[PDB]
From TrEMBL, chain A:
Protein name per Swiss-Prot or TrEMBL: 40S ribosomal protein S8
An annotated Gene Ontology molecular function: structural constituent of ribosome
Keyword Zinc-finger tagged: no
Highest taxon listed in the record's lineage: Eukaryota
Organism from which the protein derives: Plasmodium falciparum (isolate 3D7)
Automatic annotation (TrEMBL), chain B:
BP-aspect Gene Ontology terms: translation
Keywords, comma-separated and alphabetical: Metal-binding, Ribonucleoprotein, Ribosomal protein, RNA-binding, rRNA-binding
Protein name in UniProt: 40S ribosomal protein S4
Matching CDD domains: KOW_RPS4 (cd06087)
GO function term, MF aspect, one: rRNA binding
Residue ranges of domain KOW in the record: 173-200
Cellular component annotations (GO), alphabetically ordered: cytosolic small ribosomal subunit; small ribosomal subunit
Family: Belongs to the eukaryotic ribosomal protein eS4 family.
From TrEMBL, chain C:
Keyword Calcium: no
Family per similarity comment: Belongs to the universal ribosomal protein uS4 family.
InterPro entries reported in the protein's UniProt record: Ribosomal_uS4, Ribosomal_uS4_CS, Ribosomal_uS4_euk/arc, Ribosomal_uS4_N, S4_RNA-bd, S4_RNA-bd_sf
Protein name per the record: 40S ribosomal protein S9, putative
Length: 171, 257, 185
RNA sequence: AACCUGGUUGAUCUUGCCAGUAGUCAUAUGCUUGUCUCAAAGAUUAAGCCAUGCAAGUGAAAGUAUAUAUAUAUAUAUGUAGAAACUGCGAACGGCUCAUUAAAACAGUUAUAGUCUACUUGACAUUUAUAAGGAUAACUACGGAAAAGCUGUAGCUAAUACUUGCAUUAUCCUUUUGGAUAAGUAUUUGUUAGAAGGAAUUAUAACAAAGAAGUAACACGUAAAGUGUGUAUCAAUCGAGUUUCUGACCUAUCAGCUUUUGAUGUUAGGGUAUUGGCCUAACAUGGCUAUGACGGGUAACGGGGAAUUAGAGUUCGAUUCCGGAGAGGGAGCCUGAGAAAUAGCUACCACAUCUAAGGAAGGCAGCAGGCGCGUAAAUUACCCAAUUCUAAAGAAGAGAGGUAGUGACAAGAAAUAACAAUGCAAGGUUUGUAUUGGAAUGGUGGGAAUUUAAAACCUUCCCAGAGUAACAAUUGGAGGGCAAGUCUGGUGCCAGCAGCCGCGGUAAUUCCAGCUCCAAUAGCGUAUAUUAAAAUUGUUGCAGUUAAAACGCUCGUAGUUGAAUUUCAAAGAAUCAUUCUUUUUAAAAUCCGAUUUUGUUACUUUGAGUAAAUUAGAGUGUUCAAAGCAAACAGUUAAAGCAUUGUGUUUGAAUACUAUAGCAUGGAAUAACAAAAUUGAACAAGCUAAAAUUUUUUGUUCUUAUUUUGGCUUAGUUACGAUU
RNA sequence: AGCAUUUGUCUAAAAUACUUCCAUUAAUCAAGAACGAAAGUUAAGGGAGUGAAGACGAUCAGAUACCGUCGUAAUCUUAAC
RNA sequence: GGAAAAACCGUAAAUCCUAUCUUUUAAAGGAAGGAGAAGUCGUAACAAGGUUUCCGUAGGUGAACCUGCGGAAGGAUCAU
RNA sequence: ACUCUCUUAAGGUAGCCAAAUGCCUCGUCAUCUAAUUAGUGACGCGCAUGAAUGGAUUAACGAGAUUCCCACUGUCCCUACU
């Protein structure tokens, strides 16, 4: 599997000897979808344990601008940076764009500052407009296939504008 | 399979073990432990091949079962346990204390030491790590971990260490006026004063060392062991006092006895 | 696995087999020093040649050179121990000057023949094989032992030899005579 | 020891080969073989096939014993053993082969700021309890199947196996102390703050989220308070994976290869222990190539190294060490720290054993031993004593390993007479040699002493014990090359010999004998390969008018090679007449009128850091040598030294080499290269925008203002600026 | 390689001479290219002499040869090879 | 909580079909080269070898060869 | 090969083959096939081949002549049903 038995830098067909070694691995790939939390333990080399989430729904989501996090159910997968197949199939992967249920954050803000740490950084109107309708656009950052949970952050400013334009000239 | 290699051929073993060609086929392989394989001796070699208190490995086992050997103030029990670059061997039946030192040819001799100086050792720090709660710890070439070290002590500074408490008594700066002992380079087993330091970006650092006969040689920083300050060596040096005769003179001396 | 004990050729075969002048010379040398085979001459020749090669290499190196002074002196001291060079000579060109009769002259059989004991070179060679000789403190049967200068002073008879006064004569004849005398009387 | 001879001819000189010669840790084979030491040995052919046997286990304070046995004190107390079995740890090392494999693997040289790491070492931990839950083996009973290291039930019972789970410490304030408050290790996310390394998105510190896993419900009896076993994190360590640089055999009658099926890159993922086309998607359209890519060949594992060498070199390296690869051929997997493991497993194909035919079991390139293949190779040995390994580690295991047996593979030492008398021989009392005749001795036979895991050998001693010293030396030769026969018979161009020239047709210096002689000698022939000889592969170091060989001629790309020129000298001391060494002599910057820095690279010098064995080499009377890595010294038993009534003492195992590449380092010459005028500077002056310095408006904090330093725009001023 | 009548036109060339200019621009060159006698080929002309083939007459034991008489192709220009 | 069983991607053994390459190897007949003898036919070459040789080329021939065309001297001339 | 001989205007050259050309003839030898008067390659004293009456070879092309091989089938075994 890993690291040999593909063509020479010159374009040549390099010969093979040295039968595949276990320390190569190349373990079988895992999708992971949106459903009810279900995770499998994997035993990696040297007794490194890894967590294979095969379905998830409830993550740790961070509002970066205020440095605070709440746990939230994730409503749907809406855009993927790479292939359209993953988003179509409703499967999570690291850099994917999901939508989160914003009631925890809304509740936090009202409790803390009032109105619907380093105080008063004043939201953004586009983000605020999304916020009223109660389900908000977020980027997963952690690796589900490694860490057994999917953790992410609310999109902001320029990054927000980019994803909104790509996601939805327009078909 | 393709695991770790546990055997060691007698020929493939280090030259400074000083084993013969024809004595069987396999050496003692040192167990893993506080000093590197290539930079120690296994306790079997020390007892049988150097001191000569055993003629066989079996006699070494018989000696070892009896808790009459102590290295570093504590009893040891495995034959293949490492002697270490600087340590105190204590043989309790005959009340003998040895400190281990290099000669001037490049091998380890067990050197007869008084009871009073036997209660301390010299430890080079290899690293200094900052651990949780902002508490420093130093890491020694003696495999030993040093909690709560002075911030005044840095990586090439050596430290005098008690054996009862494991705590530091004092330290010797690696300042360019300090006695240095050569540990593994081509000129291993010498003492000099540190002439000069040359610092090279991204690469090995070399230090120029001067002998008591005013001969100069250079050596790589990795293998340099501070051994005292300009007044005296802080432990008692063996017979030739770290000073190396040149071959012609050595042969001339040997004849002229 | 293969043994780590080393081994080497003593001698080198001579090249150009039938060269008359060399061949007759070798026979002449055998005639003087009592050697069994051309092989004995060849080993001695090889030994001399190695010394000559070493000395030649040394003399190429410059004077006052550290390696040169050390090794040259050491080799020369070894020659003094062997008794190849006299006291007055002490320089590498007398090492080059070493010559094959001079080396043969330091064989133990030769030394015995010179000192006495035997009445012939051949007599000396059989005497040495038949265990009558002693270098003092040690006994030897090898006629190709070479004598070192400090050991030329202690050539003797073996103390367990007849000439040392051990078992004193021919057991057969003395017993036969004694039995006959007792019977007769 | 830096070496040459015979053969073109009537005779000659060349060119040129062939022939001779020697070696070959390089195989075979023929004859012969007495000693002793030393010791390679089914690799070349078939990585062909294998009968039988053996080759990995493990419990001496310390997880588990109502199988069972047992000793003391009064059924009871202690204990001591303990078959059996669970559990634990190993069995992933060793050992073997060399098929594969030609930038691969390997060697030096980096990197790991891209990671994993059992045993061992040292630091050392956080959100019912006078003691918790079962269920299982051995074991008991009934069983089944021709047979397997097959296993079915049901009843039991333990564990350091499996599974639960019990406080308490730290932070801030009055001020020893009195109050208040906090309290998850890795790991992962988001947010920031920031002891060291050349460089940090590093150690680390805080905030907001998640979060494994743990921190003893365990066993001994240790010090006149301790140990074992398990255990989170860190470090160390035995290491492992990737990974930088540079280095290879033959072939152009292999010249364009590589990219749909990842080739080269970019982005994002997934995957990994981690980096990466490692793998998916999307996007680029590249990457490599006559300085030989891409193919083909290899009777090719690589290297340490080996043989041969005057110096260059040339060939060889299955084979002691290191590294790689593989276990009939392929493939896939489990367990565990470590495996794509082969005396683990599953399947296929190719083989193949037992079977009552239903099914079962199999893998010697472990060691023996067999068949086959062949030019070509040993005992179904004995032993774990040493050497080491593995274990719950003394005490058990190990065909790892040692020791023998077989052994003319190689290598060292070394007999096969010696000697005196006479007689004879030759010489100027001599030297030599067929008669005699007393000494010397292994080999050998026996006994020991000893050696040894045990025996045998070695050594040593005591008996026996040579004269045709039958206790018997052979092999190949005797024209030339080439050292020794124009000796004697037989054959008669036949038989034959003959590396080569040639010999053999009736005197054969060559055949076949015999006699004599000669070379080497317990060794000597023969074959095939290989090195020298071969300056006949030629860098050193060939030849090309005519002997082999100048392209028909010219242009020309790659290649190789390339004029001159920029800093000359002067003075002092040593030494034997020279040599070696020191001082000063332009210009700028920099440091307190004095003090010290100044292109790049090749090249070269030193160095550094280099596995041993090998190899060169110092030391060392193994009986000598091949060797080994040791040893030496005094002492009929004590002196002597030095320890404060005691203790042997000196010791040796050096040194060098370990590519050309990489690393540091002094450098004047030699080379390159950089810098270099249809123009480029260097400085002094002035204005301008950036930074520093001083000040500071106002009821937890927003300003403003002068001054000083680097960058930029604009006239002047300099030995201003270009080698022949 | 090759080049010999006359004159013209278009071309190149070398030496010399040069107190003329440039300033190393060079030397030899695998790859590749230009030219390349004679014969031969392909195509158009052209065709005197010469003359492989061939035909005869001789010479010779024989003669497919030397010698002789005749005689196609080629030899010449253009255009390719 | 969980044994049997299945389906899907993914590893992917193996079997067969083609295709090319590789390797020896058969084959009537053809046509070479050498080796062997005293066989046949010539007279080609060496002398001006009885037509100077030899080259390149083309045609012919029983073969050695002969002839054309243009070269060379290694020619038999270094020369009115 | 080489020689003699009668004789022609000249005596078949380069080629080619039992060919749509060969009587003798189902020529002799191979090969294809299980069996070959067929196919193909050779051989060639050829009843009676052969050089613009064209000879020899040919890529492409063919409602052409000929043979074999693969695929395929009621052509056939052996017919039946519709």
């Amino acid at each position: 599997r890993d690291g040999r038995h593909k063509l020479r830098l010159t374009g040549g067909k390099k010969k093979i000897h040295k039968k595949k070694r276990k320390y190569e691995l190349g373990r079988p790939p895992s999708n992971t979808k949106l459903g009810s939390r279900q995770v499998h333990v994997v035993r990696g080399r040297g007794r490194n344990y890894k967590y294979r989430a095969i379905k998830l729904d409830s993550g740790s989501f961070s509002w970066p601008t205020f440095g605070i996090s709440k746990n939230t159910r994730i409503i749907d997968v809406v855009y993927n940076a790479s292939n359209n197949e993953l988003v179509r199939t409703k499967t999570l992967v690291k850099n994917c764009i999901v939508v989160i249920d914003s009631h925890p954050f809304t509740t936090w803000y009202e409790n803390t500052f009032g109105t619907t740490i380093g105080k008063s950084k004043n939201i953004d109107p586009l983000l605020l407009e999304q916020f009223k309708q109660g389900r908000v656009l977020a980027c997963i950052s952690s690796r589900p296939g490694q860490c057994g949970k999917a953790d992410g952050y609310i999109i902001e400013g320029d990054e927000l504008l980019f994803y909104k334009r790509k996601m939805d000239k327009r078909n | 399979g393709k695991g770790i290699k546990k055997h060691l051929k007698r020929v493939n073993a280090p030259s400074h073990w000083m084993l013969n060609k024809m004595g069987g086929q396999y050496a003692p392989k040192t167990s893993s432990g506080p000093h590197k394989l290539l930079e120690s001796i296994p306790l079997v070699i020390l007892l049988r091949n150097r001191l000569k208190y055993a003629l066989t490995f079996d006699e070494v086992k018989m000696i070892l079962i009896q808790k009459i050997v102590k290295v570093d103030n504590k009893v040891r029990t495995d034959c293949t346990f490492p002697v270490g670059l600087m340590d105190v061997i204590h043989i309790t039946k005959s009340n003998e204390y040895f400190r281990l030192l290099y000669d001037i040819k490049g091998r380890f001799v067990p050197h007869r030491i008084t009871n009073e100086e036997s209660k301390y050792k010299l430890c080079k720090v290899k690293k200094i790590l900052l651990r949780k709660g902002r508490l420093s710890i130093a890491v020694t070439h003696d495999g030993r971990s040093i909690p709560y070290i002075h911030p005044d002590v840095k990586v090439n500074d050596t430290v005098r260490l008690d054996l009862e408490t494991g705590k530091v008594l004092e330290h010797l700066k690696f300042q360019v006026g300090s006695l240095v002992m050569v540990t593994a380079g081509h000129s291993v087993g010498r003492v000099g004063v540190i002439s000069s330091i040359d610092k090279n970006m991204g690469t090995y650092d070399i230090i120029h060392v001067k002998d008591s006969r005013n001969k100069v040689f250079a050596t790589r920083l990795s293998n340099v062991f501070v051994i005292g300050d300009n007044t005296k060596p802080y432990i008692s040096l063996p017979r030739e006092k770290g000073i190396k005769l040149d071959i012609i003179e050595e042969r001339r001396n040997r004849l002229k006895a | 696995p293969k043994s780590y004990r080393n081994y080497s050729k003593t001698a080198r075969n001579p090249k150009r087999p039938f060269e008359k002048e060399r061949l007759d010379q070798e026979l002449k040398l055998i005639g003087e020093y009592g050697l069994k085979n051309k092989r004995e001459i060849w080993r001695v020749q090889y030994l001399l040649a190695k010394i000559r090669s070493a000395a030649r290499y040394l003399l190429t190196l410059d004077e006052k050179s550290s390696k040169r002074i050390f090794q040259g002196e050491a080799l020369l001291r070894r020659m003094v121990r062997q008794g190849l060079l006299g006291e007055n000579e002490e320089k590498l060109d007398y090492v080059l000057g070493l010559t094959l009769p001079k080396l043969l002259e330091r064989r133990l059989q030769t030394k015995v023949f010179k000192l006495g004991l035997a009445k012939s070179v051949h007599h000396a060679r059989v005497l040495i094989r038949q265990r009558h000789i002693r270098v003092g403190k040690q006994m030897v049967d090898i006629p190709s032992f070479l004598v070192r200068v400090d050991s030329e002073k202690h050539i003797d008879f073996a103390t367990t030899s007849p000439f040392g006064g051990a078992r004193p004569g021919r057991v057969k004849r003395k017993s036969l005579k004694k039995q006959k005398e007792k019977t007769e009387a």
